[PDB]
Swiss-Prot record:
Keywords: Calcium, Cleavage on pair of basic residues, Copper, Disease variant, Disulfide bond, Glycation, Glycoprotein, Lipid-binding, Metal-binding, Methylation, Phosphoprotein, Repeat, Secreted, Signal, Zinc. It is linked to Hyperthyroxinemia, familial dysalbuminemic: A disorder characterized by abnormally elevated levels of total serum thyroxine (T4) in euthyroid patients. It is due to abnormal serum albumin that binds T4 with enhanced affinity. This is Albumin. Belongs to the ALB/AFP/VDB family. Glycans are attached at residues 9, 48, 121, 146, 183, 209, 217, 260, 265, 297, 301-302, 307, 335, 362, 397, 423, 428, 478, 509, 518, 520, 529, 557. The modification N6-methyllysine is found at K518. Ca(2+) 2 binds at D10, D239, D243. Residues 1-170, 171-363, 364-559 form the Albumin domain.
Length: 559
C-alpha cells in the first residue's frame, strides 16, 4: 500500500532519480534542464519520507496521480484523463536544435567537472528528443555513455577511443527508439490483443522448445512491461522488466538453452541481453500442423469456446517452425486463418469449407520474398547512398504531399535495410527486412500524424499494422498531385556545406533531389541522373576550390 516507497526499495535512489528525469523529459520536452532536476530531487526526498513512514502525507497516492500532480507545475483533468492528454502531447519531432558534439577535450573536462550533471544532461537531452524511448533500456545507454567517458578520458588519444564508442551508441539509440515507437503505436492504436499476438509470434520464434502455457505467461508479463512504459508508468515498467528477466533466468531449462551467457550478466546488461537473444534450435518432434488445425473435426468447437487462445496455439506453433518467416507475415497468416474460421465455422459442413486454408497462405509468403529479392538486387547494383536515392525518388512520387525532411530521413533508413538484411543469408533476409520496414514505415506514420497532408499515408497507416509494407508497396505514382513551383532559394546551397560532413552533405543533396521530384514528378531516372551528376560535381567544384565562396552563388537556373 505504498507504491512510491514499494518501487524506491525495488529500484534504488539512482535508478529512481534517472527514470523520473526520463519520465519528466518525455512528458514536458520544451522545459529546461535545471527545472526538471528541481522536481526530481523534490520527489526523491518525498519518496524517502514515504519510505520512512508509509502513512505520512500524500504517500497513499498512485504514481500516475502523484507524478501527475507534480507534472502540473494539459492537466485540468483527473488521472484517467490527465495522463492520456499528456501522452497525446508527446512531440515525435520537436523543434529542438540538433545537439552539436563539442570538442573531446571540452567534453572530458565537463565530465570530470561534474560526472552527475554530465550524465543527467545526457539522459535529459536524449529523452526529450525521443519521448517514447524504452526507459529501462535508456538507463543501460547511460551506463555505457558513462563507461565511454570514464575510460577514453584517461586514454592518451581520447578522441580515437571516445568518438567511435559514442557513434556506435548514437546509432544503436536511434534504432532502439524507432523499434519501441512501433511497440507503443501497436498498444495505443490497435490494442493489447494485437501486441499480444505480435509478442506470441516473436517469443515462440525466440523460444521454440518452450510450451504454449510457458510462452503465454511470458507474453502476459512482457505485455505488462511494455504497456506501462508506453503509458508513462516508467517506474512500474523498470520493476516488471527486472522481475521478468529474473523469472526467465530461474526457468531457463523450460525456456531456451541460449540463456547461460545473459543470466551471468548484471541487471541492466541482463534485461538488454535477453531482449536481443539469438533464436533457440527448432525442436525435432513437431506435428503435420494441418493435421490438428484443419484435418480435425472439433476445430470450430475449440475456436468457439475461446477464440484468442486457439489462435494463440496456432500462432505459437506456426511461428516456432518458421524463424525464417517475418513476425508480420506470421501475423497475416494468423489474421487469414481467423477471418476464414469466422465464415466456415457456422457455414454448413465447416470441415469441407476450411480445407483450402493452407492454399491462402501461399501468395502471402511470396509477396515479401519477391520485393526483398528485387530491392536487394537493386542495392547490389547501386550501394547504400545510390539505393537510398532510388527509394527517395520512388516515395516522393508515391506520396508527394509529405514534408521534405520526413521524405529524406525515412527513405534514408528504408535504404539502410540493404546493408542490414541483404548481406544476411537468403533465409534470414525475410524476418530482417520486413520487420525493419515495419519500424521505418511506422516512423513515416508517426511523423506524418503531426500535420497531415497526404491522405494516402493517412490511409495506409490507419488500416492495419501488419499490411502497411504491402500498402505502401501498392501505391503507384500520384498523378492527381499538383506539381510544385520552381524555387531558386531551395536549389542554391550556401558556403556552410563545405564545413559539414560527407553524410550531412548527402542529406542536403538528397533534400534537393526530393524538391527536384516535387517540381516535375514526370521526370524519369535518366533525367534525374543528369541533374544528380550536375549537383554532385558543382559542390566539389566550389568547396574543393574555396577561392570565390560566391562559386555557389554563380548558379541560377538550369532545366
Amino acid at each position: 500500500k505504498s507504491e512510491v516507497a514499494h518501487r524506491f526499495k525495488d529500484l534504488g535512489e539512482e535508478n529512481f532519480k534517472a527514470l523520473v528525469l526520463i519520465a519528466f523529459a518525455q512528458y514536458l520536452q520544451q522545459c529546461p534542464f535545471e527545472d526538471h532536476v528541481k522536481l526530481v530531487n523534490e520527489v526523491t526526498e518525498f519518496a524517502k519520507t514515504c519510505v520512512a513512514d508509509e502513512s505520512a502525507e500524500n504517500c497513499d497516492k498512485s504514481l500516475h496521480t502523484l507524478f501527475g500532480d507534480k507534472l502540473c507545475t494539459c492537466c485540468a483533468k483527473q488521472e484517467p484523463e490527465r495522463n492520456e492528454c499528456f501522452l497525446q502531447h508527446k512531440d515525435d519531432n520537436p523543434n529542438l536544435p540538433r545537439l552539436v558534439r563539442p570538442e573531446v577535450d571540452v567534453m572530458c573536462t565537463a565530465f570530470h567537472d561534474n560526472e552527475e550533471t554530465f550524465l543527467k544532461k545526457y539522459l535529459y537531452e536524449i529523452a526529450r528528443r525521443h519521448p517514447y524511448f524504452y526507459a529501462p533500456e535508456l538507463l543501460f545507454f547511460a551506463k555505457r555513455y558513462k563507461a565511454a567517458f570514464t575510460e577514453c578520458c584517461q586514454a592518451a588519444d581520447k578522441a580515437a577511443c571516445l568518438l567511435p564508442k559514442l557513434d556506435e551508441l548514437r546509432d544503436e539509440g536511434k534504432a532502439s527508439s524507432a523499434k519501441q515507437r512501433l511497440k507503443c503505436a501497436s498498444l495505443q492504436k490497435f490494442g493489447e490483443r494485437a501486441f499480444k499476438a505480435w509478442a506470441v509470434a516473436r517469443l515462440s520464434q525466440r523460444f521454440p522448445k518452450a510450451e504454449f502455457a510457458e510462452v503465454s505467461k511470458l507474453v502476459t508479463d512482457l505485455t505488462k512491461v511494455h504497456t506501462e512504459c508506453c503509458h508513462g508508468d516508467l517506474l512500474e515498467c523498470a520493476d516488471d522488466r527486472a522481475d521478468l528477466a529474473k523469472y526467465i533466468c530461474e526457468n531457463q531449462d523450460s525456456i531456451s538453452s541460449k540463456l547461460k551467457e545473459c543470466c551471468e550478466k548484471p541487471l541492466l546488461e541482463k534485461s538488454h541481453c535477453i531482449a536481443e537473444v539469438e533464436n533457440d534450435e527448432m525442436p525435432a518432434d513437431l506435428p503435420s500442423l494441418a493435421a490438428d488445425f484443419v484435418e480435425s473435426k472439433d476445430v470450430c468447437k475449440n475456436y468457439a469456446e475461446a477464440k484468442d487462445v486457439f489462435l494463440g496455439m496456432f500462432l505459437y506453433e506456426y511461428a516456432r517452425r518458421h524463424p525464417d518467416y517475418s513476425v508480420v507475415l506470421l501475423l497475416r497468416l494468423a489474421k487469414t486463418y481467423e477471418t476464414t474460421l469466422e465464415k466456415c465455422c457456422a457455414a454448413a459442413d465447416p470441415h469441407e469449407c476450411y480445407a483450402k486454408v493452407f492454399d491462402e497462405f501461399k501468395p502471402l509468403v511470396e509477396e515479401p520474398q519477391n520485393l526483398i529479392k528485387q530491392n536487394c538486387e537493386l542495392f547490389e547494383q547501386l550501394g547504400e547512398y545510390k539505393f537510398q536515392n532510388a527509394l527517395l525518388v520512388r516515395y516522393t512520387k508515391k506520396v508527394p504531399q509529405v514534408s521534405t525532411p520526413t521524405l529524406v530521413e525515412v527513405s534514408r533508413n528504408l535504404g539502410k535495410v540493404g546493408s542490414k538484411c541483404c548481406k544476411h543469408p537468403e533465409a534470414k533476409r525475410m524476418p530482417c527486412a520486413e520487420d525493419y520496414l515495419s519500424v521505418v514505415l511506422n516512423q513515416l506514420c508517426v511523423l506524418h500524424e503531426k500535420t497531415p497532408v497526404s491522405d494516402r499515408v493517412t490511409k495506409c497507416c490507419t488500416e492495419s499494422l501488419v499490411n502497411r509494407r504491402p500498402c505502401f508497396s501498392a501505391l503507384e505514382v500520384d498523378e492527381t498531385y499538383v506539381p510544385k513551383e520552381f524555387n531558386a532559394e531551395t536549389f542554391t546551397f550556401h558556403a556552410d556545406i563545405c564545413t559539414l560532413s560527407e553524410k550531412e552533405r548527402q542529406i542536403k543533396k538528397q533534400t534537393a533531389l526530393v524538391e527536384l521530384v516535387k517540381h516535375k514528378p514526370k521526370a524519369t531516372k535518366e533525367q534525374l541522373k543528369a541533374v544528380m551528376d550536375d549537383f554532385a560535381a558543382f559542390v566539389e567544384k566550389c568547396c574543393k576550390a574555396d577561392d570565390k565562396e560566391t562559386c555557389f552563388a554563380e548558379e541560377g537556373k538550369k532545366l
